[PDB]
Amino acid sequence: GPVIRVAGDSTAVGEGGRWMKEMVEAWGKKTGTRVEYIDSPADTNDRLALYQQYWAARSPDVDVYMIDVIWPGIVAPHALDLKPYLTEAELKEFFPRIVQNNTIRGKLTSLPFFTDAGILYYRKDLLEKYGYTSPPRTWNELEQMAERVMEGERRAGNRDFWGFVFQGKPYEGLTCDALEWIYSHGGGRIVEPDGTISVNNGRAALALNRAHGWVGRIAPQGVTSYAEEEARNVWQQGNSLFMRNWPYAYALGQAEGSPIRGKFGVTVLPKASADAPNAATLGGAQLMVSAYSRYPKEAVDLVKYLASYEVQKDNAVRLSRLPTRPALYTDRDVLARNPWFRDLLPVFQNAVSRPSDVAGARYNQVSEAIWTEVHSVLTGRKKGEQAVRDLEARIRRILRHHHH
Ligand SMILES: OC[C@H]1O[C@H](O[C@H]2O[C@H](CO)[C@@H](O)[C@H](O)[C@H]2O)[C@H](O)[C@@H](O)[C@@H]1O
Numbered sequence: 001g002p003v004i005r006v007a008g009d010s011t012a013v014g015e016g017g018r019w020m021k022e023m024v025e026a027w028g029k030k031t032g033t034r035v036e037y038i039d040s041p042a043d044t045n046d047r048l049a050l051y052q053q054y055w056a057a058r059s060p061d062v063d064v065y066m067i068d069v070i071w072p073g074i075v076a077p078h079a080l081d082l083k084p085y086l087t088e089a090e091l092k093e094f095f096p097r098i099v100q101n102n103t104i105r106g107k108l109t110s111l112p113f114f115t116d117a118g119i120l121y122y123r124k125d126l127l128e129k130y131g132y133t134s135p136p137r138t139w140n141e142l143e144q145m146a147e148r149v150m151e152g153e154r155r156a157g158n159r160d161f162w163g164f165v166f167q168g169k170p171y172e173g174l175t176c177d178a179l180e181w182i183y184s185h186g187g188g189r190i191v192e193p194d195g196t197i198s199v200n201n202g203r204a205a206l207a208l209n210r211a212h213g214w215v216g217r218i219a220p221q222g223v224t225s226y227a228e229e230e231a232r233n234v235w236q237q238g239n240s241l242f243m244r245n246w247p248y249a250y251a252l253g254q255a256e257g258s259p260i261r262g263k264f265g266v267t268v269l270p271k272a273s274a275d276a277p278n279a280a281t282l283g284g285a286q287l288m289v290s291a292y293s294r295y296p297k298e299a300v301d302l303v304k305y306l307a308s309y310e311v312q313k314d315n316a317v318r319l320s321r322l323p324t325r326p327a328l329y330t331d332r333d334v335l336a337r338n339p340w341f342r343d344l345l346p347v348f349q350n351a352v353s354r355p356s357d358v359a360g361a362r363y364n365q366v367s368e369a370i371w372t373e374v375h376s377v378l379t380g381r382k383k384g385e386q387a388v389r390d391l392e393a394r395i396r397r398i399l400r401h402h403h404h
Contacts, residue, residue, distance in 0.1 A: 002295040003034040004302055007051060008066025008285070012042035013229055014248050015319055020066070023314070027305045033298060043227055044068045045172045048364060051075075055292070063293040064302055069116075069284045069353075070172070070367070072102050072109045073360035079109040080289040085300050086111075094307075094324050101357070102286050109288055111307040112324035114315055116283030117351040118180050118269060119344065121235060121243040121253075125263045126153075139184070139210060139270045142242060146218040149241045158239065163218035165231040166244040168378050173227050174371040175354060176281040177244060181207040183352050184271035184279035190370060191355035191395060195404065200392035207272070208377040208384035215378055224378050236260060244269060246283060250338070251320035266340050268347045282351035284322070316341070322348060358404045369394040 011017030021037040028035035098112040136142040146163025153161040167173035187204035373391040
């Protein structure tokens, strides 16, 4: 019979790739269909380049791809339109914002699978030890807490201890972290939904200078090479007061044998002042059937299974990843395991999107400009003022003649 072949997620990021393979195997067992799992590199931008090789070749060797929230405008020609395969009722079981995201020129490129939002992880034990009762609400507070706790922990002998870890590597994750910094300083969305390239402003430049100020001070010098997992490893070993990361890190930190089990909470990222907007970058994954799959019926059946209530529930319960079905945020077992899903649901609902809608198929070029210019600030090569001026000019060149 057919072999249905899936590329999606990575065994190099938490449990995602292992779990995905498990879920695909479970569908194959349930339906009596042969399946195969193709692994991917850790970073989303590397995965895009890999999958583009298959798409350029019109390759039938992958039937289902997991695609990033930022990808529908890029990948649409390589996607089978799913609209004819779902009833309106079935589609309404997902968040409408994400279905809209996934719909390009009327083509439903992909089903919503899990969503994602940047959050603050904090060591509750350490906040209590140093006389703090609440996590920080402002970036200045975060810096003050970090300096005090670091001084104390270093003095106590932990030479591995830092105040803050985040994703500073030059890749798509830095675009995510930098949108949060800029937006939380009142600096805008980098490129607004209407097309205005807004980043050349003093608030954005301040946000980037502030982040530079962390490097080698409250954050390790090596933070300029950290993706999700590098940050998570320092944090999970017990060596950081604070971390910015996605929801997946929570279940991993609570696993038996984690040095930090029971010692942490999560909250919204800080912001520059009380009237700035909360910032949590929208992330997450969708499920696409390849336009090149020889087995579209079967592939669609697999994608409906993966996006189903019970598989999303398993993802929430075991991997602390966020459902794309509003019903699951009221499910007793999801909430018992992850009470913070209820506390931070409004943060997830108000997550700020990267400019993938407005940049469309040029989004990856825009993002590479963002992360390279931002990285130049983190490394001390450019000041934020120059970087945002230079980034404005780059993005203007990239998007010249593009209309959404
Ligand atoms: O949260 C678990 C996921 O982390 C990565 O994906 C997030 O971070 C990317 C940037 O590095 C974003 O583009 C993406 O939207 C986020 O969901 C990782 O790539 C995923 O495999 C993990 O599931």
